[PDB]
Structures are given as structure tokens and as C-alpha cells.
Amino acid sequence: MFERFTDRARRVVVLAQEEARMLNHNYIGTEHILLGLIHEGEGVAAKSLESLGISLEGVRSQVEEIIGQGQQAPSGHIPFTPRAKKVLELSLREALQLGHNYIGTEHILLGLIREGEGVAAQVLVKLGAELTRVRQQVIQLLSGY
């Protein structure tokens, strides 16, 4: 179903894999998707994250507290956690419910919030944001460009 993803949505996905690599994780989790959303930049959810007072290095470090780097770098692809799997499912599902047929970075952020049970959401609330906060906020964004 990844063919629906926009150029930058997919770029988020590739980036999430690089984040989980160089922080030495054997899985891509809800955090690493947040990380890739940030690291993306030119697209929606990244500017959305610099607006609601969330930056890259904060999430990096928060993960290095609750997760911390791994002893041994993994190579080859890095599998999703069931949390990340559900986030991507729901990103699809959000996208469809807002009418679009593509899936952009903003739709991954919405799916992420929808899951709200895993590390991404723990990290977010720890940094200074809220789930329906950023949801309604990014919805206002799709209303404001």
C-alpha cells in the first residue's frame, strides 16, 4: 500500500529507518516515525512540529533515555513494531477519512496520534504537546494551505 505515500511520506519512512539504524535499534517504532517526520523538513508535519514546540534533538535524547543506543548496529532493513504497523495502517485510514487518496506526512502524524498508546505518544506528551492538540492543529493546517 506504500505506493499511495507521497514522495515526502516515503521519505519519512526511509528516514525513520536511518534513525533506528544510527541509534542502533533492532526495530522501527512509533518514536522513529516521529523522528522521520521531523527529519523530513520541507513537508507538512515537520513545520507542524516546529510550531507546537517540538524539535528533533529533544526527541532524539528522550529516546536515548527511555530507549538508549544499542550495543551493535543492525544492517539490512529494520522491521516495524506492531505499534508502528498500526500507525501506518491508521495513517492510511485517516487519509481516506479526510477524503484524499494519497497519504502525505500529515496523515502519518494523524495515524500516529490515533494510536496514542506507544512510545511516540509518551515522548510527545513528555515534550509539551497533546494528541488531539496536534490532531486538530494539523487539521487546521490542511485548512491553512
Binding site: 506504500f2 516515503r10 532493513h77 501506518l88
Partner: peptide, 7 residues
């Protein structure tokens, strides 16, 4: 789609 990379 949906186990890893862009699968």
C-alpha cells in the same frame, strides 16, 4: 507494506 523499509 507492512513489515519493514518500504515493504
Amino acid at each position: 507494506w507492512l513489515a519493514l523499509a518500504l515493504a
